[PDB]
Each structure stands twice: as C-alpha cells, then as structure tokens.
Symmetry: none
C-alpha cells in the first residue's frame, strides 16, 4: 500500500508520521520525500477499517494538508512498468541465476507448470524443463542465444535462452509449436 | 548519495536515524527498509567533510552494527535487473502508452528501426511499423492478444501486441517469419 501525504514545511512532521505507524502496528518499508511538500509511505496492506481511521488520523497531524493512496512510490514507478510488460507477455517468460534457480517468472510460466510464483521460484531450471543442460550452458560463459525444442506436460514448445548482464544468469521464452502454426495462419488472404 | 546501515533489531533506530538527518539538515529523498534488518538512505549530494561527519555519527547510533556507501538502492537494483532481462531479449520488444507512443524498447528494436531509444520514444507505433492501426486497436478496449503479419524494412515479422494491466497500453513482440521456420526446421533434429 502506498500513501501520499501533502504537508506544509514543518519541523518534526516526518518523525510524528513514523511514530504514528509504529503506534498502530504498521511496519514501514519505505518513506520518500518530495521537497515541494509530499511524503510517500510504503507499508503492507491494511484491512479496510484500520486503513480509514489512519487516513483520518494522519490528517490531524499539525502541518498535514491532505493524504491519498497512490499506486507506487516514486522509487517503484519504472521497475513496476517494466514488470507489468514482462508479466503481460502471453507466453512463458522466466529468468534464472548462475545456479539456474528460477528468479523472475511471468503468469504464463506459472499457469503452464500449474503453480504460483513462490513455489516455481524454488526450482532450478532443469527441474522444470526436461531435455536441456542449463548449468553446463551457463558454465559455458555463453555469447549467443540458444534455441532448443522441448516437450513440457506432453506439449511441444520452442525454448529460447539468452545470457543476462556480464553473466548474472539468463532469461528464456517458451512458444507453443501449435500456437505458432495457428498464428502464422492468422494471415490467410 | 546512498548509504546502507546494518543494524540489530532495536526499537526506535530508524526514527533516530531520520532525526539525525533532519537535524544535520540533510536533504533526504528516500529510505528503504530491507525486511532482514538493513536500512538504505538516498539523499542529495553532501560535501565530503559533511558526508564523513554524517557516517561517523551514524556508526555511533546504538544498535547500528555498520554503515557503508552503496551504488544503488534495492528498488534501483530491481530496476536494473528488469531492464537487463528486457534488453537481453533476442528479438524486438517495445511497449507503447494509450496514445501508442513508444515507452520502452530493447536493443533488438533500436537496431531494427535504426534509431537510438531516446528517439524511438518520440514515435507512435504507426510511425515505425506499417500495416497495423495501433491506436484504433488501443481504443477498442482489447482483452486479448492480437497477431498481425507486418513488413519492417522489407523483413517479414509476426507481431503479437498484448494489452498491459488496467489498460495502460501494450506490449509488442516481433518475431522474424523466417527465423521461426529455421527454428521449427531445426526442431526436426
């Protein structure tokens, strides 16, 4: 949850806000400040009730002119736009580290394997996809991308695998051979 | 200027740290807390003599076990790791906003359209790719992905454009018709 607090230029206002979060059982994840007169607050979802009296309570603080909920902290905005677009990808995307452990994985990567992100992230890559040697490839210090054909839950896909940053690991896409043929026909004069 | 402060889990530390910076007149922009027990500070540039005094006084706050400058906030490390996935993707990827203006684009895209990313961002999608009404499709309130065969600089592509989030634009993926056949031909062995 992200709050934006509008306030005048007053001594001690930021402290009195953090005290208030502490009094109320709320553990702070982030606070950002705009010199113009805005304070953003990051903490875990409140239930609706604790939420509304808190807003009211923040508005009573000396120097606060207004509060609202906002979709992101200034710090989150761009990396959330990046995540959104990668999560939107209609087919499986997912990244792995140097130990080939799954890191980033999109919704389709989850639905195909039939599991939520946090279990899926517990896997190395060869545990999820039969037929390829991830760790020996990532050991290979790779230049180019790799294309392999794989079957996953009895389904034909093409898997492409590309190194990431020096070698901080790799990311890879999967495309259904069946979806490709249906979709290259999405032209029929 | 960014610091990382390691600290024991003691009541009042974060706020005492905030009081310190308020009092030294430090132009604090951001704090991020690491669920472990690490606090990151982002503030405007200090002269060297003050940065030093600051870091010295911080290391003497009770319960602080260390302080060090760091190149990035966690949010910024996250942004970097997501930019790196996007930029590694072998084939063109871009996103566009609700006016179909280009927001992000990977190097594969910069290379295709022959423009550095800065300039790519000046263009609507229909200024870069013929044979698709991007803006019209955006105003359709699309739910589903769309595939279109497009020709870009005389090279044939299958184009999949997908809607992003609570409609904020779209993700575009272009795959060469020819690399696909080559890959599905290789898949035969």
């Amino acid at each position: 949850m992200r709050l934006e607090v509008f306030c005048e230029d007053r001594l001690g206002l930021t402290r009195e806000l953090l005290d208030l979060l502490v009094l109320r059982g709320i553990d702070l994840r982030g606070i950002e400040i705009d010199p113009i007169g805005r304070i953003y607050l990051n903490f875990a979802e409140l239930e609706f009730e604790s939420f509304s009296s808190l807003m009211a309570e923040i508005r009573r603080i000396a120097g606060v002119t207004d509060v609202r909920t906002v979709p992101w902290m200034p710090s989150e905005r761009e990396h959330l736009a990046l995540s959104a677009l990668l999560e939107a990808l209609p087919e499986p995307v997912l990244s792995v580290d140097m130990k080939s452990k799954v890191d980033m994985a999109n919704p389709a990567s989850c639905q195909l394997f039939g599991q939520k992100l946090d279990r899926l992230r517990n896997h190395t890559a060869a545990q999820l996809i039969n037929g390829f040697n991830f760790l020996r490839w990532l050991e290979s210090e790779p230049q180019d991308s790799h294309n392999e054909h794989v079957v996953i839950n009895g389904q034909n896909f093409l898997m492409e695998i590309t190194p990431v940053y020096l070698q901080d690991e790799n990311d890879q896409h999967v495309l259904t051979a069946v979806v490709m043929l249906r979709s290259t026909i999405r032209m029929g004069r």
